Amino acid sequence: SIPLGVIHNSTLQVSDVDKLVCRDKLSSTNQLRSVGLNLEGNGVATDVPSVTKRWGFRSGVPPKVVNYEAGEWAENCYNLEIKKPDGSECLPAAPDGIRGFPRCRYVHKVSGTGPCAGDFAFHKEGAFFLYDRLASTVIYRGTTFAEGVVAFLISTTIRYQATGFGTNETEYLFEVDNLTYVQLESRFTPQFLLQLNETIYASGKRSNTTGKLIWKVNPE
Amino acid sequence: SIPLGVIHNSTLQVSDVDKLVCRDKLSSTNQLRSVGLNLEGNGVATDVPSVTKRWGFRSGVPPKVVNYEAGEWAENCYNLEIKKPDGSECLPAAPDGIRGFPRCRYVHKVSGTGPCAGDFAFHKEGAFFLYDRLASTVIYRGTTFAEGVVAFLISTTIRYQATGFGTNETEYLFEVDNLTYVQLESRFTPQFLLQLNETIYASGKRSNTTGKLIWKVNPE
Amino acid sequence: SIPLGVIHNSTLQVSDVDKLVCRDKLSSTNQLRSVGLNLEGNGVATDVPSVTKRWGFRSGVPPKVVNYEAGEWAENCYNLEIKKPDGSECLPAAPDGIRGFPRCRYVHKVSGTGPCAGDFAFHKEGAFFLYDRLASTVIYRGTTFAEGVVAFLISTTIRYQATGFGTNETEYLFEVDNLTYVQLESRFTPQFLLQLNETIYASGKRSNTTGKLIWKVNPE
Amino acid sequence: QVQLVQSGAEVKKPGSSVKVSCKASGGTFIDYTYNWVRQAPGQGLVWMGRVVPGLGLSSYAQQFEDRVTITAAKSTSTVYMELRGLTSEDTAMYYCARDTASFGWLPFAFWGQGTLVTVSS
Amino acid sequence: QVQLVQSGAEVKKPGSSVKVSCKASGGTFIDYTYNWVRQAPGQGLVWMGRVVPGLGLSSYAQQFEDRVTITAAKSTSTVYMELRGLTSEDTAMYYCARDTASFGWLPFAFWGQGTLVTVSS
Amino acid sequence: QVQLVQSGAEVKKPGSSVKVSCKASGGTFIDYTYNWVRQAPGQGLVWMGRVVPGLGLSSYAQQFEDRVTITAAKSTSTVYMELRGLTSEDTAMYYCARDTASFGWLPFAFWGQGTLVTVSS
Amino acid sequence: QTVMTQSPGTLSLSPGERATLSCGVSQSISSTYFAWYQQKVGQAPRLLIYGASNRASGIPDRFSGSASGTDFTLTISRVEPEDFAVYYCQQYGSSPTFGQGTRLEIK
Amino acid sequence: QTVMTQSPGTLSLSPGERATLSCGVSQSISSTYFAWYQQKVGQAPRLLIYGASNRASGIPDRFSGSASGTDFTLTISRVEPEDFAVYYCQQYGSSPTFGQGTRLEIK
Amino acid sequence: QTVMTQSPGTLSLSPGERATLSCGVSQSISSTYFAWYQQKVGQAPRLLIYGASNRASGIPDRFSGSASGTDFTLTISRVEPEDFAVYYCQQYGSSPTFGQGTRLEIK
Amino acid sequence: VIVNAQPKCNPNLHYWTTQAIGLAWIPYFGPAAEGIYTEGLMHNQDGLICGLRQLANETTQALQLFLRATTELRTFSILNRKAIDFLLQRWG
Amino acid sequence: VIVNAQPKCNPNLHYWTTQAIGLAWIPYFGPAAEGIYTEGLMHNQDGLICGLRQLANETTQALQLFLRATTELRTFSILNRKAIDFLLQRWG
Amino acid sequence: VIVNAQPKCNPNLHYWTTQAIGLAWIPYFGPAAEGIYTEGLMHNQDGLICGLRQLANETTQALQLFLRATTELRTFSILNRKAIDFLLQRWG
Ligand SMILES: *[C@@H]1O[C@H](CO)[C@@H](O[C@@H]2O[C@H](CO)[C@@H](O[C@@H]3O[C@H](CO[C@H]4O[C@H](CO)[C@@H](O)[C@H](O)[C@@H]4O)[C@@H](O)[C@H](O)[C@@H]3O)[C@H](O)[C@H]2NC(C)=O)[C@H](O)[C@H]1NC(C)=O
Ligand SMILES: *[C@@H]1O[C@H](CO)[C@@H](O[C@@H]2O[C@H](CO)[C@@H](O[C@@H]3O[C@H](CO[C@H]4O[C@H](CO)[C@@H](O)[C@H](O)[C@@H]4O)[C@@H](O)[C@H](O)[C@@H]3O)[C@H](O)[C@H]2NC(C)=O)[C@H](O)[C@H]1NC(C)=O
Ligand SMILES: *[C@@H]1O[C@H](CO)[C@@H](O[C@@H]2O[C@H](CO)[C@@H](O[C@@H]3O[C@H](CO[C@H]4O[C@H](CO)[C@@H](O)[C@H](O)[C@@H]4O)[C@@H](O)[C@H](O)[C@@H]3O)[C@H](O)[C@H]2NC(C)=O)[C@H](O)[C@H]1NC(C)=O
Ligand SMILES: *[C@@H]1O[C@H](CO)[C@@H](O[C@@H]2O[C@H](CO)[C@@H](O[C@@H]3O[C@H](CO)[C@@H](O)[C@H](O)[C@@H]3O)[C@H](O)[C@H]2NC(C)=O)[C@H](O)[C@H]1NC(C)=O
Ligand SMILES: *[C@@H]1O[C@H](CO)[C@@H](O[C@@H]2O[C@H](CO)[C@@H](O[C@@H]3O[C@H](CO)[C@@H](O)[C@H](O)[C@@H]3O)[C@H](O)[C@H]2NC(C)=O)[C@H](O)[C@H]1NC(C)=O
Ligand SMILES: *[C@@H]1O[C@H](CO)[C@@H](O[C@@H]2O[C@H](CO)[C@@H](O[C@@H]3O[C@H](CO)[C@@H](O)[C@H](O)[C@@H]3O)[C@H](O)[C@H]2NC(C)=O)[C@H](O)[C@H]1NC(C)=O
Ligand SMILES: *[C@@H]1O[C@H](CO)[C@@H](O)[C@H](O)[C@H]1NC(C)=O
Ligand SMILES: *[C@@H]1O[C@H](CO)[C@@H](O)[C@H](O)[C@H]1NC(C)=O
Ligand SMILES: *[C@@H]1O[C@H](CO)[C@@H](O)[C@H](O)[C@H]1NC(C)=O
Ligand SMILES: *[C@@H]1O[C@H](CO)[C@@H](O)[C@H](O)[C@H]1NC(C)=O
Ligand SMILES: *[C@@H]1O[C@H](CO)[C@@H](O)[C@H](O)[C@H]1NC(C)=O
Ligand SMILES: *[C@@H]1O[C@H](CO)[C@@H](O)[C@H](O)[C@H]1NC(C)=O
């Protein structure tokens, strides 16, 4: 009972599931394509807590995998390298055939730890995690993904750290060096943060010993 | 060359493989369904030795898996947790995607040991072991199944123990307690046996130490 | 955009991908068959260095698997049991479902070691390694294969040894006994070599202690 | 005190079988375990097996497996046992003893007289 | 020698907060780390936190986390700190010290006078 | 006793090669292994390699690999060897010896006279 | 399985003397699953003690005992002529077992 | 984290006498991330030595020191009346730390 | 690979005296894959013993020997003037090897 | 038509299959799969149940001979092939 | 027709898919798969991009309810089923 | 038509495929799969064998370019797609 998209004589129209349309000429299977779209194009925030809060763990329900031939280039993508509080891997390893999406600009890894009760991390609004051209309903460990939907129609690594990943009370850091971190805030975009990381690193005004120095961005 | 079922103007008829039938109107793929049926509805006995004797191990021949969308509720189902005489697992673990059938009333586990020469346990009459909606030609370890067939058309756990499972000379027991067992006989149905287990357990007239006391049911 | 073969009123013709042919009557899916052909029928040499030089290791590119229903009997087939120079397995184990081709006459195993940089051994001319009826683009460890192509249309074990397997500078031996080997040369066919092995073995003029004696075939 | 009444002595030939019984009276048949035991002079007492008519079940001593079958006639309140494959080594007094199952205890509070089984040739 | 100028002593009640500041003059505000430190008589000196207007970042001593907020007014070349949740144990001289970040070194070369923060009831 | 007949002494210059041979007579050529061996005075005997015309195979001592090639002319019942890349250290008597392969044994029962190979400059 | 050895396997006392008997068992038996009996010659044995401590009906106060673990003990404060019987140790919580029996004889 | 203990925590010398002070640290500090200070009473401390060896501006030659590993040492060739100050050990390469301070008193 | 050392590497006896020679080998050689030779000066060596025990054709009874494992022994009951030869140990079951040879000289 | 000819036949169905509707579409939100099963009873109206049992029993042989001849472990394409042949049979 | 009715819409595509041509057909020779991707830009000609975004958002629910009801982990047959129904719908 | 144009061609087939019939339908009973293969010989009647060899050689390139562009490891749907296009080509 899945609807398809079809092009009208003018603009785009909803193709029916039940009605036979006389103008809907289908001469080949090459006219039916699976296209992936990124939800960032619908205004979904790409901040770290904004995306992680949209994901969560649940038990019982099995994963599903779907196939694309084409899709949108993503500006912002994520991975996860999250372990349970005692190090016991929150996500299952991506199975054979699951690879990250073709291309993006800013890819985040959000490594870290947190409570992860459940069998899988599912998207809360039901968006798909887009891997390669094989999107799925769950997040797989170590493999990057885009956040998106399936239409059915006729760079750089940031590697933020995470604490308390699978719960509501969390912390996230941008790593400049092994001893140097910056606290994240949603008002600061990847461009800001990366310009900031180059300034800190290049100026050298950061920890240079063995101890951690963690910076907060001034309120202004 | 697999025949399908089709409904006649009155009753059910065999659909041909080769003949084109003018009344066989097929407007959608939603008219073709895979339905699983249980052989208990054909009079197949559900007693433990009656079902285990219908299964057996053979080498060389590979397993096959088929798909259902729907099926019959089973009154009597089985699992197997059988190890070779030295503990070396008779059945392969069920592979990913294999789960037990949706619903049943009396589910038996028949745990135990016995000789199991061969690669897989196959049904002797060629019935399928129905798992989830994905039936197969072999029994998989740790996962329950129904005994049945594929039509192609237009609760409680008993956990009996087993000895000599894969051969003709066997023994089976109904466990009441760790020290208390009842010898099985085909004249005693699950209702009898469970009423018996409640009576024994509730009356307390069973072993209460560390030693085994195994009961036989009186000949009358 | 894959062309199919179709039979003309007389001989065989190329079936088009785009043109509708009025005489191309297709009453059933049973008229479309996948047939495997062996390249030995096109004159490809079956000598050991001749075949191994046509295979090689590369990284990055993933494997693919295709399906046959039928095919040609192969006179000459190969396996590989090649380990990296330090014993670290050059080829991945064949995955479930991959088995050797149905039938052949002379099956070689080419066991041994050599450098194998890359993820998979691919055929250099793009031929498929034909396994069971499931051919693939890569060689899988421990499973025999034929060398061939896919048409889309309407015995004895030799076990040669190898050194330097994955490079241009190699050596190969025919094993007669644990201490007895013969150096291979392309002018000597399986019939020659096997007649030679029976003569050596039967005459007894070979090493009979613990030391290796390796024979070269006289230049005439 | 609920009674158990048994038959007198009988002589059997090797390879045969003997059926023995205890009539229960003065109390419930269904509520108690009726246990068969054996005692040859100088050997001490061993358990052979039992029937609990209330459960409809019976159980046995391992050394008496198959050779000893224990049943009951609820209708006559009588405990029965058959010992088969008799040999001269089986000569002993055979007793029923009723337990205290109705009291929540499993030891023997009520005892019979003992039937002598003699096997000879 | 770039100067740091501070306000005089102030008395606070427990549970309140004090805002203190250092006016930087005679040199760059942006180029240096302005570090807040605390010294009560007899206790020695500890670091509380810092601001580096050039990075726009600040950092803190763990024991002063949350209670101490450090900022800066680039427009007035003034270093600011607020200490809150004040208790009598917080009485101390509070200082800014400017590091030698512009020289490639992180120790303190320039120091203020010290503002006394007194907390009492 | 089957005979082996060899050519006389020859002097070679360093870097060249010498071809030597043994004519077999008084017995079968095909049935025996014809082995080439080397003995310089005071050094003892070593094996260089062999040909077994019946198998059509040859084999070599490792230290003589490549430099020594052993063949045979079935048609003239003659054993041949070529030693190349000659140096002064190669001076020795070169012999064929026939084994007892036809008897089921592999040691040498028949021996030649020895051809002296001299290498000098 | 609850193997019991009675010790002494025989006692020899003049009537009126004090006597004790104990049984060792290969495994612990809860005292509640153990009982003592007195067997007169030619008679079925009489239950003496329940749960290794409670006198059975009609049993004189001269009889007493206790148990824990693998240690089961019976005593008679004065052995009367009528008490020179074979005493037995019984396990009854599961398939039952008995010790070999101990005869108390007259000296 | 770079915990420092100054020893002696106090010195007592007549003016004109030779004195030394050292600090131990729980972890190595590169000498380049360590400095010495002189604190006069009622005053902010004055930096004396950079990188545990280089005299700070305006610092007399009577002051010297060196360091490696976990061993940091300060010395004054002659302690003048003006030098009877509290000396401090500072770590500054990361979140900074200080030792408790050592007072050099007049004897 | 079947490395042999002959010992003594030289013997010195008056003609008519008794002599023995043995060879050690780095690995066991079945006796059936081992032989002894007698080399006269300027001559190709003559096979003496087959399988480390059987006299070769034309070999006098004064020559004898035996072997097992890694221990190969040759003896002459009386060494005649004609026997003051270089004796050799040969392995022939695979790629063949020889010992260095032992000269029996006249004393 | 199909006639059932075996010793006995069960004339009643207790039937199950699956459906999904509502917010369940979001897998973290919805129930585990064992809960998406629907159910009900059916009777042997005009011999249909017994006829179905017999068809499934006769069809089992064809199914396994078919499977013996394939390479796929999971052959879930039988009815898709049938749909193709249904049209191809008349429209080829 | 389909009308987009959400807080915001991105009117531009940066699109990717794959093609293969030439000697690349031989996998040892050709590039790794990340290099067989083609790309380019497209605009919201006559409202087509925003309409597509809305369709994909509405279709997501149908897709997951559909998937909840299947057994396959990898269901890559949706459009093949649609092609069959397209013809069957008129040619049954 | 297709013309073979390579250095040599083998004009004979020794052909294999599979069939299943009889009690073999029950997998414990029947033979291992290597035994369900049928076989026989065929000749180059009117050039058919050499033409087939050439087609398979020309088609190999299209096949791998096709596979490079997919996501499935096991693509066993090529002829099903062809059957769909066969009808769709004329009945769309
Ligand atoms: C398809 O398009 C739809 C719009 O036409 C999308 O629906 C909207 O989705 C946004 C989120 O992207 C919702 O806005 C926020 O949702 C969060 C989520 O809160 C959840 O947790 C709290 C816990 O207390 C619980 O109370 C909530 O019920 C949720 O379970 C809220 O916290 C925010 O306050 C805010 O509501 C829109 O409300 C929602 N609109 C509608 C009409 O449903 C839909 O998500 C798109 N599809 C996909 C796959 O993304
Ligand atoms: C489809 O319907 C058919 C009936 O129309 C079913 O066929 C019948 O199946 C029953 C069993 O369910 C057979 O009855 C018994 O079979 C056992 C099996 O014995 C096997 O082992 C012995 C070993 O000594 C061997 O000799 C036998 O040949 C068997 O290999 C027998 O022991 C019993 O005596 C009795 O025969 C019916 O005989 C059989 N009827 C027919 C006409 O074939 C069929 O099983 C149904 N399909 C499925 C998947 O269950
Ligand atoms: C389909 O039919 C085609 C003919 O119509 C086949 O093409 C021919 O394939 C043969 C090999 O089977 C080529 O002959 C030799 O190829 C080797 C390969 O050398 C490679 O490595 C060297 C390294 O130095 C490199 O320089 C080369 O370019 C190769 O990458 C050469 O070494 C030999 O000298 C000789 O050329 C034919 O040349 C080729 N003919 C044509 C017209 O392409 C095709 O292989 C068949 N398909 C399959 C799957 O086998
Ligand atoms: C955060 O800032 C750091 C500091 O600049 C960025 O990392 C640096 O990236 C450059 C490349 O732009 C690296 O230089 C290259 O190094 C390789 C070493 O194999 C050399 O072959 C190249 O020729 C070139 O010199 C530099 O090493 C690297 N430094 C560090 C510490 O990582 C970092 O990428 C920024 N983070 C983000 C998310 O942008
Ligand atoms: C054989 O008889 C036994 C004895 O009654 C049956 O097992 C018993 O089943 C009841 C439920 O009907 C269990 O009670 C429940 O226990 C849970 C513990 O978490 C508690 O939360 C519930 O509120 C309730 O009290 C009882 O524990 C269980 N006893 C034992 C020993 O298993 C058994 O199911 C019967 N066998 C068959 C095949 O029917
Ligand atoms: C190279 O030559 C050897 C030597 O003949 C070939 O191997 C031999 O093959 C025969 C069968 O033709 C084996 O005999 C059989 O042995 C089994 C043992 O279970 C017995 O049950 C049979 O009745 C029969 O006697 C023989 O043992 C085997 N010998 C060896 C050393 O392998 C070998 O196949 C030839 N190589 C090639 C590639 O042809
Ligand atoms: C997390 O949820 C709990 C209630 O379970 C609430 O008390 C707490 O404040 C929440 N924390 C955050 C960061 O939202
Ligand atoms: C941490 O140090 C390791 C070397 O031990 C280095 O490879 C790694 O890149 C460093 N991490 C960061 C964020 O600089
Ligand atoms: C099992 O089969 C054997 C023959 O192989 C037979 O002797 C034995 O009695 C059979 N046992 C049972 C329980 O059927
Ligand atoms: C056996 O004992 C374990 C506890 O050790 C208990 O969990 C289990 O349910 C018992 N089994 C039976 C049949 O009562
Ligand atoms: C292998 O290739 C190298 C060049 O990389 C060349 O020098 C060498 O001779 C080649 N060896 C063989 C056996 O072709
Ligand atoms: C090598 O020896 C083993 C026994 O140790 C034997 O099984 C094997 O077949 C032998 N190999 C050859 C080539 O004869």
Residue numbers in the entry:
A (entry chain B), B (entry chain C), C (entry chain A): 32 to 185, 215 to 280
D (entry chain I), E (entry chain H), F (entry chain G): 1 to 121
G (entry chain L), H (entry chain K), I (entry chain J): 1 to 107
J (entry chain F), K (entry chain E), L (entry chain D): 503 to 521, 526 to 598
What does the published report state?
All glycan cap antibodies make contacts exclusively within GP1 and are heavily biased toward heavy-chain (HC) contacts. Through molecular mimicry, the CDRH3 or CDRH2 loops of each of the neutralizing glycan cap antibodies characterized in this study bury analogous hydrophobic residues in the cradle, displacing the anchor.
In addition, we also tested two new antibodies, EBOV-293 and EBOV-296, which we isolated from an individual treated for EBOV infection in the United States (STAR Methods). BDBV-43 and EBOV-293 also have much shorter CDRH3 loops, which may be a consequence of their use of CDRH2 to bind the MLD cradle. BDBV-43 and EBOV-293 have CDRH3s that share this feature but bind to GPs with geometries that restrict access of the MLD anchor by their CDRH3. Therefore, BDBV-43 and EBOV-293 alternatively utilize their CDRH2 to access this epitope, which subsequently undergoes a large degree of SHM. The glycan cap antibodies described here generally have high levels of SHM, with EBOV-293 containing 24 mutations from the inferred germline gene in its heavy chain. In addition to differences in the size and shape of glycan cap antibody epitope footprints, the number of contacts associated with residues also varies for each antibody, with some antibodies relying more heavily on less conserved GP residues, such as BDBV-329, and others having very few non-conserved contacts, such as EBOV-293. For example, BDB-329 and EBOV-237 only bind and neutralize BDBV and EBOV, respectively, whereas EBOV-293 and EBOV-442, for example, bind and neutralize viruses outside of their autologous virus.
